[model samples]
Target: MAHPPQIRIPATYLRGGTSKGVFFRLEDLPESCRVPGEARDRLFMRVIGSPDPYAAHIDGMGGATSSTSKCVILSKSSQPGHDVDYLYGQVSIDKPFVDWSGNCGNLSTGAGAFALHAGLVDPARIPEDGICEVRIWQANIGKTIIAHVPVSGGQVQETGDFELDGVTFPAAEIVLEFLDPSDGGAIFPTGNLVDDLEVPGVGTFKATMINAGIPTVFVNAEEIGYRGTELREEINGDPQQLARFERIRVAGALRMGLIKTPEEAATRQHTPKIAFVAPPRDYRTASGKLVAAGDIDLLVRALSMGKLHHAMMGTAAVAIGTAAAIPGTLVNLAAGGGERSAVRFGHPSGTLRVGAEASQANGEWTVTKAIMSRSARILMEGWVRVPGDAF
Candidate 1:
């Protein structure tokens, strides 16, 4: 019997906001994995220990959840005015591929820290006792991100008392500004604030589809046979409800211009997140925290990677902000049925305050910036050992 050969590649493990992923400097990657192609995907999949038949990534660093099985590659940007070029990959735990169809807004917090810590940023731009502004080009979704990281004594500050909803610890706050957070170059891809999506055998429902952050579909909770307050078990445990949402997701995907055909949605399950919104209601978050309805503008629940995300994807919050800023969108209606520049939405975990500067120009809705705050911390850094022939 022959044994797999060994290779040691430089890698870093980091927890970004509510998610943890393996991070790499693009220059540190093996030559074969530098560019986008099969080589890169194969290397990342092997490193993350994916395609596990048992669905548990026990052999690798992956925590075996959609939020944890992720990869990020950062490099000094060649593009003008950008500090670093950041690319993200959502590796499928049961598949041999990485989905580059969207961005991980949570991990955007990590990109700036990694870029500065790895000396990828221009030294002149970093200040000793102030915030360091790192401009990022999100390669996955073709978006611009500005990360404002706190600095003290000329170094990045990683510790503080800033509390984020989904995360456990308090860290220094990093404000992320997502520029032009939309697909198809339009904030509302469907060209309508609300659309009546007719799903076969599932009945018709009014939906608000937008392209901010990652493409997303929003519907009212009452119309979907749901109330504003639902715990994960109440939803995830119900197979029938899950299927119904999937059907709606597929229909909305086609309507939002995310897929050429409805069947294509199965293979691309990450993008165009399906979520439901309702007015504030009391609920218990995943962490057992009591979320008071009075403390929030509205209630939001987002789906991620085909499951009810424990909290909300940071990117989805951008879409939420965008929709809330535009009147007649479902999120806006749920958040008080008005036009605004920002909103503080209540999720199961807690309340998150996000802002989107949305306006109408040239007969289309455009968002100049979507802002949110998150934190990042380095977990590990060293060589990730893998069989040399794994790729």
Candidate 2:
């Protein structure tokens, strides 16, 4: 009897910020899976064990959640001053699609350290006793990311005092500066700060849409009959509630000009993420710790893949930071109704602080950069064995 061949591919497992993923070097991929096509996506899907109706990645490396079902491929950058080109893929657990329309701000920290290990960065860039700047080109969104990675003894440092709420252990700090973070250089692609999205069954509401990090829609929670402090179970368990949110998401995507119609939303679910906002409120995190009202600038909960995210996406935090810096956006209003340069918002896992620089030019609002800190650690590195015919 004939059997399928076997292949072992080198890969790294790492957790950055509140999310984790499998990392790879583009050159290490099998020749059949080298470029973008069905073979590449199919290989990753098999490695992650997707298209399973059960939504549990038991036979693969996927964590099942949007935050965990991710993949990264790095290569020496062809862009100026950039050490590596980082590409991200968000594989769907229950579906047969991979979203590559944006960036993962959390895993971005991991990208820098991974590049250093892959020898993509020149040795001279490391200063035995200080931080080394690794310029990374985000291939998913075509943006520049500068990482301030600490160095000790000519190696990447992995200890520090910086604390990010979702993570429990303390690690070395990596400050990332996302330059021109807005996607396609459009802050508000729809040419308005707020738009009245019309949904079939759902009523219309004013939504503040932006293209930072990821395309996102911000609407008041009260308008949607929510308090803005909900956990995963509260919404994921109720199919009706999930439907309502998706309805709003589809309508907002169309209104924001991200898609021509609601049906087109299926192909672009990764972008124009739907989020509801509210003023500061007291709540308990998923870990049972208390978050006081004064602890955060506002309350924000985002959806990932499709359901409510266990926590916030690192890229969305960039969106929140950029929106908060603007004077009249809903996020700014939720953060106390005034001009601000930064904001620390509360999510289900905990809290994260992000900053942005905004200014009015040519009678239009523009954001220059978004800054945030996150930690990355290599969990494991070895050959990932899989069936050669899996792809």
Candidate 3:
């Protein structure tokens, strides 16, 4: 049988914060894959070389880990006052699916820079040497993110001294503001700061379910027989431990109205993250960096794509900041029961500081915005080739 020749598609590979992904401009995608559907999903999967049982993305651009197996599309925004429309997809390494249930806060930084790089933003809005504010419309979650990118000589600045854990080298910092980050109006969907989430096989656990940056379920590490300072290998290497976290995550999803049953969680593996929290304690990171107890307010270890994240996901960090700002939440209690707009939490990679402003009015909690800093840079750009009929 003769197979169709491979086709080359324009694409860019970039590192956004601690994560990296393949990026594309909407118009540059193949006609059939321009819209969201099976064709689009299949094309991205092939581009990332997904469903590989070996879990090694040697055949594609993906790095196999949750932070690396991803794709993004950017377009000139139709929304009033927004500069670009940003859409993100989380590719499953061993499954033929792309979860689009949430936004990627880390890539949100790159999307802003990509907007400038791809000429999606108005050239007049960019300056020769100053901060170029790009208003991004998060298509997945239907939210607004403002990315303040530093520019020099009328181009996106990609080098600096800002160091982010999980990423080895320093890069220019991009400030992100997730305005009204909650998927819904209220930060707490259950109308409570904390809930007693009961899992089928697992015991009841006190959980803080919030929808700030992304829907997340936070529980005390002690309740789950953990210290909240475990490295990725410490948890990912254990099959039983991974399964237990998935159960608790699905249970929280049901209680938070994200999914009706556990079976639905299999298809929607991107949102409503599960994490364990504890008071700050001295620990050593996987890179042998020492994190002092007093330097941070709390410790958080979150999981994504059914595995422990080496570093904190940017969206999960938003949830931690939002929950910590609110009183009576598990994250707040672990942060010493304070009502503050900012918090520094220790994660497996290192420590991160995030800020959020939460307020309660009419007996409803709302997060005005969450703030964080991340860096982005283009690793490679040109075209990505795949089988012509791959989609």
Candidate 4:
């Protein structure tokens, strides 16, 4: 007589860094979807309403962009000295999959605030008016992220005058420190700061393949016929360029040992970011702001999920900071090449400054941490409903 009834699960829609995604508590997910598997993937895809032919998520909560079509899960941390365990999922808009291969640097801000907003953090630890340090265990990458969130009146202070380029509104800033970012693997996966990355039919270019915040491949812009001052319209509209970028990403994945073969990239699309760098030059941003060459150290344009990102990715920014700290990498060379603790780089949206503390011992490099400031705010919070059998 009836197909099925809808089930409602508590959820929060929050803007973290430059990205927005749906957030869920591990306890609120359906018993079956609480763990990883096809059920969890299907439920998340259903929740985000992916695989739409038109690319418009009209029937779902997704905003039809890489920065918006995302989800996160948070719970009490199992790791010592951490307050919460954070997991991120990058949902594909036109594919039947959720890429959990990497962490979202931007949403790491939301994860910290959500931990307090969701009452997961100890009340005693959150003061009446001060900064609450939320120790987060980034489960996907097995890293620790420490977030200093501003608190007032016994709650997370979400509004302020602090400004971030890509985001439309100003909000209270959250400072995040990615500790031991390069501990998961070799900072230089190829054991060289620069490598000759040969892309079949695409020519060979010097690239920096580093595994810091995330697996990222950095190449000089001129080698690929770019100035690195490109906006979304200059590249996203061209199918051939997108295909070329994908091919480059696939090739980089192989060189970095992220994939054993080329075909694996279709499913593992999140990690091993592909970006191009250029020396600073005067340019206008997407928002019509003039970014003079003197305002930034270098110019960087990165692709995520097959499209030019509106802004820079937080994790990729970490990779930039880490690579820039160590001289001789493509990123470092683009920034005028030297020992540096921080650099401000211009993106399509505007500019961002990130810092990294690095050291070398016996010819090997290690970045102790990458630091950046981002803001997070709850856009909406309630119960998201789906068919009982959606999972």
Q: Scored by Cα lDDT, where does model 2 land?
A: 0.85
Which residue pairs in candidate 4 have backbone atoms (N, alpha carbon, C) closer than 3 angstroms, thus clashing? Answer: none
Query: Residue 343: error of model 2 in Å?
Result: 5.5
Candidate 3: residue 369 Cα off by (Å): 1.1
* lDDT tens digits, residue span 29-141, model 2: 99988788898898888888887788989988998899889989999999888899999999999998888897888899999888877777888898889988999999988
> How many backbone clashes are present in model 4?
0
The residue pairs that clash in candidate 2, if any, are none
TM-score for each of the candidates: 0.68, 0.65, 0.67, 0.67
How much does each candidate deviate from the true structure in C-alpha RMSD? 6.0, 6.6, 6.6, 6.6
Model 3 agreement with the true structure over 75-110: per-residue lDDT tens digits: 999999999999999999999999999778778888
**Superior candidate under TM-score, 1 versus 2:** 1
lDDT of each: 0.86, 0.85, 0.90, 0.91
Task: Count residue pairs with overlapping backbones in model 1.
Answer: 1
For model 3 the TM-score comes to 0.67
- Model 2, residue 187: distance off in Å is 5.7
lDDT of 1: 0.86
Model 2: per-residue Cα lDDT at residue 391? 85
lDDT of 4 by residue, 111-213 (tens): 9999998889978789999999999999999999999999999999999988887789999989888898642677887899999999999989999999987
Positional deviation of residue 9's Cα in model 3 after best superposition, in angstroms: 1.4
Candidate number that wins on lDDT, 1 or 4: 4
